[PDB]
Design a binder for these strands. Sequence first.
DNA 1: ATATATATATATATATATATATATATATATATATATATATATATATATATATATATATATATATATATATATATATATATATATATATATATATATATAT
Length: 131
Amino acid sequence: AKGRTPRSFSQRYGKWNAKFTAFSNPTVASTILTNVAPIAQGNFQTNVPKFTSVNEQVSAVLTQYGVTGPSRAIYQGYGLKVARALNRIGAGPALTNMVAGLKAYYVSAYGANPEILDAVTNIILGSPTGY
DNA sequence: ATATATATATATATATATATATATATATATATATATATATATATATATATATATATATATATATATATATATATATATATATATATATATATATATATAT
């Protein structure tokens, strides 16, 4: 019962402004944040190691291919994207479809190299295709 | 009229202590000066240079921290949405029925 009626710009802005003004109160923000701190710490601890590892391994792969500068970000981004899928839905045919779609995305929009994309997905999932 | 004690006086003189003076000199201490020089400490300057610390700059580069951005992607948290569905809670209804 949250996304049932359409909301226009004035409605979205009114509700967002009300909630943002409310959160700016010292007591409201302090209470909410000190209550959710342990759960936030637990979620960070459960999730971020899987992505720092991907960062390090894709860095190692990128240095062997000579990628320097902001062009590394491209492949780093792709790596992280793939990892997200592996964390979200798991391994299987759905992950194959999403890997193919992400490669098409990056090759067509961002001018990525197919060979380096294969190398990144190989260091992450085990094979270029991801089967 | 006598003896002991607390004081005031008339007259000269003596010893103890607190001070003020007339005349010169000596020693100790607190300071002010005339004349040169030295040593210790607090500071201001003339001329160059060095070391320590607080900052401002000329020119490039590096590391740590607080933020703002150019471009895509990831994770944690506060919220606003597009579209179905589920769970907890605060209420309004359509229809019958039960309990406080």
